[PDB]
Design a protein around this ligand. Structure first.
Ligand code: MG
Ligand code: MG
Ligand code: MG
Ligand code: ZN
Lengths: 114, 66, 82, 101, 151
RNA sequence: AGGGCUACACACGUGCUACAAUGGCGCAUACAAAGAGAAGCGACCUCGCGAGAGCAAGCGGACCUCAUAAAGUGCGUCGUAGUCCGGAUUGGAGUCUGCAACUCGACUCCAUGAAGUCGGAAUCGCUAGUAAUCGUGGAUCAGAAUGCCACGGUGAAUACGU
């Protein structure tokens, strides 16, 4: 459970309870579980502490959790700072990837208060 | 000066990409890593990018078209 | 975005004016109508006057300002609120 | 009929077929992986953009022949939906007849 | 139909067990055009029915039917005076129609792990008269007979 | 030549996707119809998770390509969780077309993956292969569809009555 500074769940397939880590979805889940050499349908409670250390020093290669958080944060921060169009899109809290705003900008703008 | 109200004025290191290392006191605390100095600066010196001041030699290489 | 096999993009007039300026330029404004050109590491230190539809808003070219386009730093519509 | 737009169109098609087979190989310099040098490929792109942007075959709007309408065009007939339909009714469009199935 | 009385569409009998009523139950159970899955789940639930209440398919199915077979129902109409529901007789075809509809709608809920499990749940509990199907049957029997303003 | 028609405190109309077990995913396995195709379709082959790239036969077509139909079928897996549902949004890395992808293209890989628990007043469509769902293709078109048009695969309910 302690892998990645996080407390990944138990009694869940290893491919799946590996996804609870920022930086690993289902592709990298299978990728780490293979590059470290672990069966798919073994539950987390079906894993020993040796395989746990194997995951510790294997998932390391892919940047994950806190570190990725900091990375995307500094990425959007350099966006804002550079004075680019995307920086202003980020400052305003609008679609940044070129969506329409006259309507349907809800994920960014937020629900309809006014 | 007074006590218990003034910031800490430890002696830190001013290390820039210029490669110059200056021993300054400041309210920084940590080893300070800089970008441009009185040396290796456009206004002060003739070299436009001087030396360093950005390892953007990084992606120019990826596209590398003269 | 642009394909790598094709390379970067910058209009010839801009490239050549920039050379004639990097050699001899002290911000004698370079006005570029080309917003689609990319920013070359040789333009560092420039503040090219890029169009935005009616006005040449200036954009100071810096280190981090390398992998984007001249139009990326010249907003085109003036929104303030309702 | 705003023959200004139609003169733009005829000049564009003429100049696109004029500098045709030039930009053809100037683009062939750029897709091959054996561009000998960045310079072979790179210098091509600059030379491509020296060539009139008004001589690209993407600038054409493919306007209808009788009326020069931008929309509703049909590559089979060369006519807008309006002109093609009036000609189809008058019988000047061979083989065509109101469909029903 | 103002001048028509369009008869009911003729249905084929369930080729597996001969029961056309069950073949109609399948469609009433069918959703979205998926009839393969519909017949799958209905046959599986009838197997579970036979093995849970002992009595086989073509009998437990019926006893689950009559035990919810609706007698009458109110229907909105007005002729003068006021608006009110009026108790009306539901035809035998409409009787087992409403029966099948209530049964399948019930079985769609109370979902725990499987379709056949919950379906046989509702079928058996209807036969024993403790399901929610029989509760809505009782409600329909109370609502209709609560008021009989005019015959 | 540049920008805008793509702006966004907001309201409405269509449409798509979903809120899950009749379901999600993995493996294997079959059944269409119609059309388009020459400055076009493009087999195979090789390289690239992938977008595709190189190679490139043949095809003016009941002959060559799109092009694998999908839903489905059997196996197991998921076990009712904002989840192995969703897949919006955002960061990075790309591919494609085009003079050119900042405003403002499409798609691909990787990464958090948000609302959303079936929906107020009200309100729309449909009488049989029709609704419902599944996929396919064409036009426009250098590139750009969830729209449009066309095609097929499963395939129901009720019409008592005015
Ligand atoms: Mg003192
Ligand atoms: Mg616009
Ligand atoms: Mg009718
Ligand atoms: Zn320095």
């Amino acid at each position: 459970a302690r892998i990645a500074g996080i407390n990944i769940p138990d009694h869940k397939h290893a491919v799946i309870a590996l996804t609870s880590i920022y930086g690993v979805g289902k592709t990298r889940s299978k990728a780490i579980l293979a590059a470290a050499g672990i069966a798919e349908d073994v539950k987390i409670s079906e894993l020993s502490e040796g395989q746990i250390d194997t995951l510790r020093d294997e998932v390391a290669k892919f940047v994950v959790e806190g570190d990725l958080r900091r990375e995307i944060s500094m990425s959007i921060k350099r966006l804002m700072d550079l004075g680019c169009y995307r920086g202003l899109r980020h400052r305003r809290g609008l679609p940044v990837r070129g969506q329409r705003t006259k309507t349907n900008a809800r994920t960014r703008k937020g629900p309809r208060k006014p | 000066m007074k006590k218990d109200i003034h910031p800490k004025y430890e002696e830190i290191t001013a290390s820039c990409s210029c490669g110059n290392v200056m021993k300054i006191r400041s309210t920084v605390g940590h080893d300070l890593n800089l970008d441009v100095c009185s040396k290796c600066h456009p206004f002060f010196t003739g070299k436009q990018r001087d030396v360093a001041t950005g390892g953007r030699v990084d992606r120019f290489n990826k596209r590398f078209n003269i | 975005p642009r394909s790598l096999k094709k390379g970067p993009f910058i209009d010839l007039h801009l490239l050549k004016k920039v050379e004639k300026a990097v050699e001899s330029g002290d911000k004698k404004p370079l006005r570029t109508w080309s917003r689609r050109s990319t920013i070359f590491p040789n333009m560092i230190g420039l503040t090219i006057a890029v169009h935005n539809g009616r006005q040449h808003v200036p954009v100071f070219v810096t280190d981090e300002m390398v992998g984007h386009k001249l139009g990326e730093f010249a907003p085109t519509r003036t929104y303030r609120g309702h | 009929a705003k023959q200004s737009m139609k003169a733009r169109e005829v000049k564009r098609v003429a100049l696109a077929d004029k500098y045709f087979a030039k930009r053809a190989e100037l683009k062939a310099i750029i897709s091959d992986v054996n561009a000998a040098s960045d310079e072979d490929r790179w210098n091509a792109v600059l030379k491509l953009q020296t060539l009139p942007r008004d001589s690209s075959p993407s600038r054409q709007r493919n306007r209808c022949r009788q009326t020069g309408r931008p929309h509703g065009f049909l590559r089979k007939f060369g006519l807008s939906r309006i002109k093609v339909r009036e000609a189809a009714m008058r019988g000047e469009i061979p083989g065509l007849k109101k469909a029903s199935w | 139909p103002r001048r028509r009385v369009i008869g009911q569409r003729k249905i084929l009998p369930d080729p597996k067990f001969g029961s056309e009523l069950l073949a109609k139950f399948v469609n009433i159970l069918m959703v979205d055009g998926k009839k393969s899955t519909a017949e799958s789940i209905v046959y599986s639930a009838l197997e579970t029915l036979a093995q849970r209440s002992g009595k086989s398919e073509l009998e437990a199915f019926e006893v689950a039917l009559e035990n919810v077979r609706p007698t009458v129902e109110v229907k909105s109409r007005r002729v003068g005076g006021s608006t009110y529901q009026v108790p009306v007789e539901v035809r035998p075809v409409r009787r087992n129609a409403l029966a099948m509809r209530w049964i399948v709608e019930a079985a769609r809920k109370r979902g725990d792990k499987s379709m056949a499990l919950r379906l046989a749940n509702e079928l058996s509990d209807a036969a024993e008269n403790k399901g929610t199907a029989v509760k809505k049957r009782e409600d329909v029997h109370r609502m209709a007979e609560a008021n009989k303003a005019f015959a």
